[PDB]
RNA sequence: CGGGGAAACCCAGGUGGAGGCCUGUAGCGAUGCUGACGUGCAAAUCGCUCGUAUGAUUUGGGUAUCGGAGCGAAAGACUCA
RNA sequence: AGCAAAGAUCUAACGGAGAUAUACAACAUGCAACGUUGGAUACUGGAGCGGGGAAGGAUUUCGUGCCAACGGCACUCGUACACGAGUUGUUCGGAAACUGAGCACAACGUUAUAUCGUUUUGUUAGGAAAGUGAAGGUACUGAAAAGGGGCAACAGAGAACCUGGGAUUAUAUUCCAAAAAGAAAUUGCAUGUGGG
RNA sequence: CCCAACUGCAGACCGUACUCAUCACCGCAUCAGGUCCCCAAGCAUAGAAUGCUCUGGUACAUAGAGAAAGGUACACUCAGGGAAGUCGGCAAAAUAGAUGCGUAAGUUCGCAAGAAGCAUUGGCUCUGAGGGCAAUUGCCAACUCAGAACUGCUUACGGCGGGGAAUCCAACUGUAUAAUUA
RNA sequence: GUGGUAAUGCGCACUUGCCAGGUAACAAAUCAAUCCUCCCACGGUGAGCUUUCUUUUCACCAUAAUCCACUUGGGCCUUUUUACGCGUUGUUCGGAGCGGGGGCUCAAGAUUGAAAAAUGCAGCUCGUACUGUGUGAGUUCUGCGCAUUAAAGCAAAAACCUGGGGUGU
RNA sequence: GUCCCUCUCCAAACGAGAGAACAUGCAUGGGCUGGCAUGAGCGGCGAGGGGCAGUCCCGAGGCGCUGAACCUUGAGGCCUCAUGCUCAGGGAC
């Protein structure tokens, strides 16, 4: 897994061809944006709940956006 | 020894004791001269006197 | 343990002191009090039980106020400047229920971080 | 086994796990891609 | 109370290559995990004394191959082979011995 | 053990097939002799050493 | 480290952890009961007792040397009861 | 004769043909024994009647049925018997591809006869065993490299993957499929952008 | 054509069950024999000795009734005497842990030696000594040893040397007749 | 290619034409000791006990690979010169450079993040949502070798690695 | 009438024997007789010790209730000193 520091990366990576998903995890202290691309899983830690929502909109509607939640025994 | 070695390091670093008297005690602490930590200290305070 | 202990010093053992402030525990008796299995008598006995049987330093029955025991409303509260384990008040309650022999009926389980709740068995 | 499953049944097999029974016969578990339904090709043959 | 553990890699004998960690997993279970054999690291030549070099990591097979060339060596001449003292003796010998010839040769020719 | 050549594995594969009992109908062939299989086997006795 | 002596060296307290060294498990053996058993649990086993247990030690896999021959710290031992 | 080492079983309800089985009450006229579950008591006592592997075995594993024979007593149980099923790998072990004590194919020599000997002290053969190609000229020209081929390690060398699971009657670092429960490592080739 | 970070597609072969043993192997067998490796809890204790125990695993070894003689035993005891027994102290008994004092001849100076022998030991309530850290002072852990007062012994788990005076032989450790001689 | 007085730092190329050296590669005892186990401490959840006693007894309290950014032990450089001093439990060391200040590097960790709570476990609520999450005794990974008694001195090769020289020129 | 079943123990390896046959026979209890050595629980003497300011606790032992508690016929002691059980004894020659 890899870390994203600047936000000018999280725009580039999402706009790469391979990235098939962006998983968005909500934590009390921060929210994770987990970009799933082929080799690595790129994540972005915001830490400020205001800035987080605004980023979650800027993500291009092209890429899937999964809300990461607890999944029970669906299977 | 590990108790007697560390009390001499702690004095020489606090300059309660010379490098010359340190080496005079260090070698004796190995010679079973000092029966315990309180015995070492009484002998130092007796040298300063 | 630095100073070696003594027997005979087992009377009045020091207990750690909570330096920040008050700590407060609750015992919620509402459910069984409603059905009459408790009465105003047993609630007067339940508070008294802790008043008599909680042991502050080594000794029980004498609590100066570093710990205060209040029956306000139907819920028992224990406010303490001392450091107690909440586990220990779950202990005294069970030990009270076994004198009344209510213990095949009323169970206690932790509803909230500072409180226990008397209930019934399925 | 990946090729002959493309010939016979015209379905791509993403994963194959071969095995050899104690009987000498070589079983295979062919996983055919999620664009394809294996319950479809089954009734195209058998099955129940 | 000491959960007891089992080998996993198909080799059950314990030699210097099969050495095993104990591991408590997020499922809370103990596990043998194989340690990795570790190289003794880059050394000076045996004849000169076998002491290890500086600025050179202990990387092992496929660890030494995938690492950048700098972790295995040093920039001055004979980087990943000789220590600095063995370099400056071969720098000095190359010089002082070469002139002892240039002087002893001229004398013979001059004579 | 876990180890085996494949050539050896098959020889035990064949010998597992041969342990089946004699079919019921094959007793009813006209002029039949075979009743129960005389070559049957159990690992507890007469061990194949393959 | 200290004490003695002109010298040469000699005494005493610690540290250190040597040995085909001693007690003692596992291990490897197999002394005594001339014990059990002696148509057995067993075509040599069992019980307590006993030898050794940092070494000329014990042990797995592989590999080498055999029939008038092999191998033997030597007993005509052993070489698939 | 005997079936006497390893302490040991007991009770209730349910199962089962195995019963509570009778020509003027019940004991005195259906005995003993079996499985599972709950309870009780006890043993092993981490050098284990614990959990996994090699050698060896090779379906004994797993589920359903079943009691003829077999488990030297007994079974309703079984490692019996019958009928179905079960062993999933880019990374785990081997092999592809290491060398060791060693082995013996070629070669040579012996022998009436190879079914004999030599064959790692750096290495076969009186012995011409290199099929590779530096530099250069455009698939020729010839520097350089002495000592043929192979086997021998599932405990030495070497080896890129980890946990989670509701994924099972039985296999799993083997299975899981778009939120792969997921996270990585590495080999080969290939296009694209960046540089040379 | 090379290099760099990504991406795309592919990643073949064989084993994989179960067993590893008071029933799965060898010993004619589900035989008290034999058989390599890994993991290894709590308390007493010097402890992988030995005793009991939580997790795991077992109640399977043909059973029931049951006081004969005679036996076997990984079972005990005995008045008085104490080797008179017997080829012979065979077998049994005995000794025993730890701490202190003490210890002969002989000697290759290493030993002999745990020679021999004497004494102490519980329980309880205290006391002393043995340190770390932080800035003389303050706060703290983990144990061991010694001493005292009071009080008790029915000498009371398991485990654990009998010792001394001499002769013969081999210097010693070792090996050695698998199944009568170590 | 390029920085630092230096130990060495930073990420155009090709080198199995040739050569040289490394890794692979082996080693006692003492002391310290990793993962991990046990025990104690803290106290959270459930359970056991309750005539009396027990702030109680029992169970659980977990974080895999991979990839990022202070301490301990060694080798070393520069500086100031040392003939008594530094240092270990321990049989040591120094003008062939001890000790001190300041640095370079290596080994084993600690720490903060990515993975990662979305998982695991337990409890509870009317097949769902919530709640909880040590200067102790062992331990051979390691320190650790030109490394053991030794008339014992403790395998080899593939594969990889860096350099010399050269190519680029 | 004898034998079996049943109950007893002067008998007994199994047979056999002595006996009983609604019988203080059996069961339990009481009392004797005997063994051990003063139970659990509780309460105001104790080397010392800890709190709070003399008290209230910690403490092996000790003292009182306490020759107390428990055991006492069973392979099989005593006393009818009490109650309980039996309700056509069954079967075979």
Q: Is D27 on the interface with F (CB under 8 A)?
A: no
CB contact under 8 A, F10 and D22: no
SS (H, E, C) D14-25: EEEEECCCCCCC
Chain F: closest CA distance from residue D43 (Å): 31
Tell me which of F4, F11, F16 to substitute to probe the interface with D (most D C-beta atoms closer than 10 Å).
F16
Name the token pair of C27.
């015992």
Distance CA C52, CA E13 (A): 65
**Å between C79 CA and J124 C1'?**
26
Backbone Cα Rg of chain D:
12
Chain D residue with Cα closest to F18: D23
**Å between E40 CA and J155 C1'?**
18
Greatest Cα pair distance, chain F, in angstroms, is 47
CB contact under 8 A, D23 and F16: yes
- Pairing of the two strands C23-28 and D28-32: unpaired
**C62 in Cβ contact with C56 (< 8 Å):** yes
Name the token pair of B13.
């670093």
Chain H positions within 7 A of any protein Cβ atom are 46, 50-60, 79-83, 86-89, 92-93, 154-160, 162-167, 173-180, 182-187
Distance CA B45, CA B37 (A): 13
Chain D residues touching residue F12 (CB < 8 angstroms): 22
Q: Is F9 on the interface with D (CB under 8 A)?
A: yes
Please give the C-alpha separations between residue A60 and each of A10, A16, B16, in angstroms, as whole numbers: 11, 11, 72
| A21 in contact with nucleic chain J (CB within 7 A) | no
Cα C15 to its chain centre, rounded Å, is 16
Method: cryo-EM
Chain F residues touching residue D22 (CB < 8 angstroms): 12-13, 16
- Pairing of the two strands C75-80 and C67-70: antiparallel
Q: 3-state class of C82 per DSSP?
A: strand
**Which of the 24-43 residues on chain B come under 7 Å of nucleic strand I at their beta carbon?**
36-38
Name the token pair of F36.
């129960």
Question: The dihedral of CA C99, C103, C105, C106: what is its sign?
Answer: positive
| Length of chain C counted residue by residue | 122
| F48 in contact with nucleic chain I (CB within 7 A) | no
Distance CA C5, CA D12 (A): 79
Distance CA B5, CA B29 (A): 8
* Resolution of the model in angstroms: 2.9
Identify, with chain letter, the residue nearest to nucleotide H56 (CA–C1'): F1
- Pairing of the two strands C23-28 and C75-80: antiparallel
| C79 in contact with nucleic chain J (CB within 7 A) | no
Q: What DSSP designation does A43 have?
A: E
Neighbour-count burial for E51-61, b at 16+ CB within 10 Å, e otherwise: eebeebeebee
Distance CA E80, CA E64 (A): 13
Distance CA F44, CA F37 (A): 18
Is it true that the peptide bond before A69 is cis, omega within 30 degrees of 0? no
Q: What DSSP designation does F23 have?
A: P
Nearest to A25 by CA among A72, A65, A57: A65
Q: How many CA atoms lie within 13 A of A55 on its CB side?
A: 24
Q: 3-state class of E84 per DSSP?
A: helix
**D1 in Cβ contact with D13 (< 8 Å):** yes
Q: Is D22 on the interface with F (CB under 8 A)?
A: yes
CB under 8 Å to C101, separation ≥6 — which residues?
A: none
């Amino acid at each position: 897994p890899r870390e994203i520091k600047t936000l000018k990366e999280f725009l580039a990576i999402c706009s790469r061809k391979d990235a098939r998903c962006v998983k968005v995890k909500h934590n009390p202290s921060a929210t994770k944006f987990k970009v799933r691309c082929s080799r690595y899983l790129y994540t972005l830690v915001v830490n400020d709940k205001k800035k987080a929502d605004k980023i979650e909109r800027s993500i291009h509607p092209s890429v899937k956006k999964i809300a990461v939640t607890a999944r029970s025994h669906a299977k | 020894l590990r108790i007697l070695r560390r009390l001499l390091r702690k004095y020489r670093a606090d300059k309660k004791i010379d490098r010359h008297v340190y080496r005079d005690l260090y070698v004796r602490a190995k010679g079973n001269v000092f029966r315990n930590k309180r015995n070492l200290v009484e002998h130092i305070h007796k040298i300063k006197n | 343990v630095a100073v070696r202990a003594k027997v005979g010093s087992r009377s009045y053992v020091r207990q750690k002191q909570l330096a920040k402030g008050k700590k407060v525990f609750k015992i919620d008796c509402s459910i069984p009090a409603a059905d009459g299995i408790f009465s105003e008598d047993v609630l007067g006995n339940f508070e008294q039980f802790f008043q008599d049987n909680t042991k502050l330093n080594g000794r029980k029955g004498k609590l100066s106020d570093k710990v205060r025991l209040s029956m306000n409303d139907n819920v028992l509260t224990i406010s303490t400047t001392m450091a107690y384990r909440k586990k220990y008040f779950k202990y005294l309650t069970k030990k009270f229920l076994k004198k009344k022999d209510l213990r095949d009926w009323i169970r206690i389980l932790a509803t909230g971080k500072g409180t226990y709740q008397l209930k019934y068995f399925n | 086994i990946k090729k002959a499953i493309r010939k016979l049944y015209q379905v791509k097999a993403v994963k194959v796990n071969t095995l050899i029974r104690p009987d000498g016969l070589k079983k295979a578990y062919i996983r055919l891609s999620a664009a394809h339904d294996a319950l479809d090709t089954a009734n195209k043959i058998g099955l129940v | 109370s000491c959960p007891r553990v089992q080998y996993r890699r198909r080799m059950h004998y314990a030699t210097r290559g099969n050495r095993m960690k104990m591991v408590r997993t997020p499922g809370n279970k103990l596990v043998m995990q194989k340690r990795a054999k570790r190289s003794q690291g880059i050394h000076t030549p045996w004849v000169l004394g076998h002491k290890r070099l500086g600025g050179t990591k202990a990387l092992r097979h496929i660890d030494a191959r995938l690492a950048s060339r700098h972790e295995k060596s040093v920039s001055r001449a004979y980087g990943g082979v000789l220590s600095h003292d063995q370099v400056r003796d071969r720098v000095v010998r190359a010089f002082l011995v070469e002139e002892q010839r240039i002087v002893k040769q001229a004398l013979k020719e001059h004579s | 053990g876990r180890f085996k050549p494949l050539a050896v594995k098959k020889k035990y594969a064949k010998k597992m097939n041969q342990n089946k009992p004699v079919p019921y109908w094959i007793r009813l062939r006209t002029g039949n002799r075979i009743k129960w299989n005389e070559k049957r086997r159990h690992w507890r006795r007469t061990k194949l050493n393959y």
